[PDB]
Structures are given as C-alpha cells and as structure tokens.
Structure 1
C-alpha cells in the first residue's frame, strides 16, 4: 500500500490523506480501535480549530470495532460545535453505523450500494451496560423507541441505504451530487 503524493501562496506537496484532511474530510476506514479513535479525534479537534462552523466530512467504510473506541469518536463528534456530514461508502456495520447515525441531522449520507448494520457481532453486567449505552445512542439519533432498537439490533442483517434512511440512521441516498 503506497500512498500517493499530490501537489496543491505557492505549491505544497501532501500525501493524499493529508490533502484529504485539508478538504475537511476525516476517514474512518476498517476496524475501529483506540489508535483509529485517537487519530480521528485529533483530526476533529484540528478541523474545529481551523473553523468551528465550516462542515466536517466523515468518510465511513468500517465493519465496526472496539466499543469504547467508537464511543470515544461519538462523544467527540457531539462535543465539537461543527456540523458533521457522515458518508457511508462500502459499508457501515456495528460501531460504524453508530458513527454514521451520529452525524448532524440532515447531513447523514450513503451511496447507493452501501450496506448498513446496527447488529453487533470484561464482566457480564459490564458488557450489558455498554449494550444499553448503544441502545440509547441509536434511539436518540434514529428517533425510534428503545423497543424498536433492541428488537432491530437482535436481527443479524444488513440494511440497504433506503431502509436505513427510513429507519432513521441516515438522511440522504445520493447517486450523484445535487
């Protein structure tokens, strides 16, 4: 995996991901662990410092990951004052779909062929407390009841972008820009 260099006062050379960061785009790609969370959180704090009002784009192609790391990203998204556009490309499963649903209302996007899953693939009470935290967060942003969330999360299935929009996880399914 070699990262390409692009060229953007004068001419500066970045690696393509750093150039993506200058377009206020943050990537949440692959499994989410403490390392990914810290990097995402760092980028969110940086982008808010450059403007606490210009939107931030969050590119999400993740199968999920560690819950506390995902929750670290979630809490930081709520904490910063910027509007956050989430973009599901490929898939958003487990904590990935939670972050997708955690975007600013009206700015949660998916491309047409993405797959979304809210099903989720340390002591016992302790695992259940984290589950209830996920129930509350999903209920809050999908605007569904806890009963619908608990029931839906019990089903080992993915949603298409259209059914995820009807469920309240995302707001727009775009084939091309509007």
Structure 2
C-alpha cells in the first residue's frame, strides 16, 4: 500500500528514494532483488558517476550468487557507496554492508550484524563459494583469512560497535 509524494511531478515514495540516490536492500536477497538493485546502481552511475550512492540494508541474507551479483556491481560502479545498516544485516547482507566505500559504512545503534552463514549443488562447489565469501570479507575488514573463518563459524550476531571494531563498518550513528 505504497504512498505517493509530490515534488511539480508525483512519484511513489520508493521512486522518490531512488531520486535522492537511495537504493534499498530490504530483505531476503534473490535474483530479482539483485536485478532491481543492480539496475538501480547502474542507473545512478549513469546520472553522475562521482556523486555518492547510499544503499540501505535490512536483510537476513539470501542466495549467495545473487548477493555477489550486487557486490560485484558495487565494486564496478565509479561512485562512492555509503552503506547503512538498520534492523539487521546477516549473511550476505553484512557482506554488502562491509563492502561500502571505506569510511562510509554505517549502522544505527540497535542494528544486529551477522557474518556467520545460516545453513542444490556439489560439495566442492559450496566450499568454492564459501572461500569467495572468506576472501571478500578479508578484503574489506582487513582481517586475516583464519580470523575471518573462525569468526564465520560462531553462530552469532554482533552489535554495531563490535562490527565496527572488526572491520565491517566505520561509524555507528545516533544523529545527523
């Protein structure tokens, strides 16, 4: 039941959010989510490839290759990407969260962050995908492999404060 706003043109509030260069990553990440997000990120680059992009994550995770789709598009565009976590970023959600422009990775105070991966393909393939997750997290947290994979074994959430200290985000904000 999505509301309309005027600005004189008239958009629904989500079209409006994308006009402010805000892309939502809200919920379980599947291919068509990934498709929406990728579409938006590439449209904002076309508008201005130096102007920043804010991406808002409230995601329990999802389909791993769909998330890497987003992640890869993040790495590709020319824009700074402020990532913001509200509610939670678990599994691929905090992967996207940890993959913002350094210095521009934010959570609100009561957010919950998980890098552990909640548990139809071959066994070695899953391990392959799981190393990919291990290196991406190592890249952006500036942590070691063995630290990352020990960490990813703890079935557990962090506070915005621990996640900052671990390298997943940069600033925990209450106010602007």
TM-score category (smaller protein): over 0.9
C-alpha displacement of 1:131 = 0.3
Unaligned segments of structure 1, at least 5 residues: none
C-alpha displacement of 1:169 = 0.1
Corresponding residue SS for 1:91 = strand
Count of residues in Structure 1 that have an aligned counterpart in Structure 2: 174
Distance in 1, Cα, partners of 2:162 & 2:37: 28
For normalisation by structure 1, the TM-score amounts to: 0.97
Unaligned segments of structure 2, at least 5 residues: none
C-alpha displacement of 1:74 = 0.2
Listed one character per residue, the Cα deviations across residues 62-101 of structure 1 (whole Å, up to 9, x for unaligned) are: 0000000000000000000100000000000000000000
Mapping 1:84-163, distance limit 5 Å = 84-121=81-118, 122-163=121-162
Corresponding residue SS for 1:157 = coil
For normalisation by structure 2, the TM-score amounts to: 0.98
Mapping 1:1-178, distance limit 5 Å = 2-8=1-7, 11-121=8-118, 122-176=121-175, 178=176
Task: Give 4+ residue runs of structure 1 displaced > 4 Å after superposition.
Answer: none
Corresponding residue SS for 2:117 = coil
RMSD over equivalenced CA pairs, Å: 0.4
Distance in 1, Cα, partners of 2:53 & 2:156: 30
C-alpha displacement of 1:24 = 0.3
